[PDB]
Structure 1
Amino acid sequence: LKDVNHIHPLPDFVRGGFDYVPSDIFSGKENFEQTLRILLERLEFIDQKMVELAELRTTLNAEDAILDEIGRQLGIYRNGLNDPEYRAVIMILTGNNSKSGTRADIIATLKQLFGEDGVTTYKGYNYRLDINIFNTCMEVTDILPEIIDMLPLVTHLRVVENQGY
């Protein structure tokens, strides 16, 4: 019924405070109101930017100019990656820390990179595993090094990518 995240722009900030004019003594004088409005409306701008200072620092929306700072703390350097996929690698490596490389587990990680039906996985008798891609939205060669990391120590892997079925 209520949002748990209380960090939001204050609703109707301006009309508040004006509500504290005692008994409409000054209201309708058009000389005191403008003086008060001019000062209060400055806080509006500062109040608004208080959110982006917290909202924009999250990894989901962080821009490349500062996303590097988030990656730097985790040891994931930009190298030659671009912004749209640099976000992906950060997620992939971080998610690897609570993984076991099971068949059900592997499907889950690939799920975040190719939608619901964009990926499928065949399995083979002698350590063979196969990955199929149908709806890639980013160039895969630069993402490939991580795709190896979350697999068992002895996996034998093939990678094939195509658009659609």
Structure 2
Amino acid sequence: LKDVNHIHPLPDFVRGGFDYVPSDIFSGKENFEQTLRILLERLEFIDQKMVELAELRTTLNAEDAILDEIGRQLGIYRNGLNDPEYRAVIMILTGNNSKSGTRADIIATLKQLFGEDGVTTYKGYNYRLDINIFNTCMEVTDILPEIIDMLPLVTHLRVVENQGY
């Protein structure tokens, strides 16, 4: 019924405070109101930017100019990656820390990179595993090094990518 995240722009900030004019003594004088409005409306801008200072620092929306700072703390350097996929690698490596490389587990990680039906996985008798891609939205060669990391120590892997079925 209520949002748990209380960090939001204050609703109707301006009309508040004006509500504290005692008994409409000054209201309708058009000389005191403008003086008060001009000062209060400055806080509006500062109040608004208080959110982006917290909202924009999250990894989901962080821009490349500062996303590097988030990656730097985790040891994931930009190298030659671009912004749209640099976000992906950060997620992939971080998620690897609570993984076991099971068949059900592997499907889950690939799920975040290719939608619901964009990926499928065949399995083979002698350590063979196969990955199929149908709806890639980013160039895969630069993402490939991580795709190896979350697999068992002895996996034998093939990678094939195509658009659609």
Tell me whether the two structures share a fold, i.e. TM-score over 0.5: yes
Cα distance, 1:57 vs. partner?
A: 0.0
For 2:121, what is the secondary structure of its paired residue?
strand
- Partner SS, residue 163 of structure 2: coil
* Distance of 2:21 and 2:2 partners within structure 1: 30
Structure 1 residues 80-110: Cα deviation after superposition (integer angstroms, max 9, x where no partner): 0000000000000000000000000000000
Unaligned runs of 5+ in 1: none
**Number of residues paired by the alignment?**
165
Shift of 1:71: 0.0
State how far apart, in whole Å, the 1-side matches of 2:60 and 2:128 are: 35
CA distance in 2, matches of 1:12, 1:37: 13
Q: Partners in 2 of 1:95 and 1:2 — Cα distance?
A: 30
Q: Report the counterpart of residue 164 of structure 1 in structure 2.
A: 164
Q: Which runs of 5+ in 2 are unaligned?
A: none
Aligned partners of 1:14 and 1:59: how far apart in 2?
A: 32
Cα offset for 1:3?
0.0
Instruction: Give the whole-Å Cα distance in 2 for the aligned partners of 1:4 and 1:100.
Output: 33
Which position in structure 2 is the counterpart of 1:124?
124
* CA distance in structure 2 between the partners assigned to 1:4 and 1:118 by the alignment: 34
TM norm structure 2:
1.00
**How far apart are the structure 2 equivalents of 1:19 and 1:61?**
36
Q: Normalising by structure 1, what TM-score?
A: 1.00
Instruction: Give the 3-state SS of the residue equivalent to 1:12 in structure 2.
Output: coil
1:66 Cα offset (Å): 0.0
Pairwise CA distance, 1:76: 0.0
Summarize deviations over 1:115-161 as a string: whole Å, max 9, x none. 00000000000000000000000000000000000000000000000
Q: Tell me how far apart the structure 2 counterparts of residues 52 and 142 of structure 1 sit (CA, whole Å).
A: 31
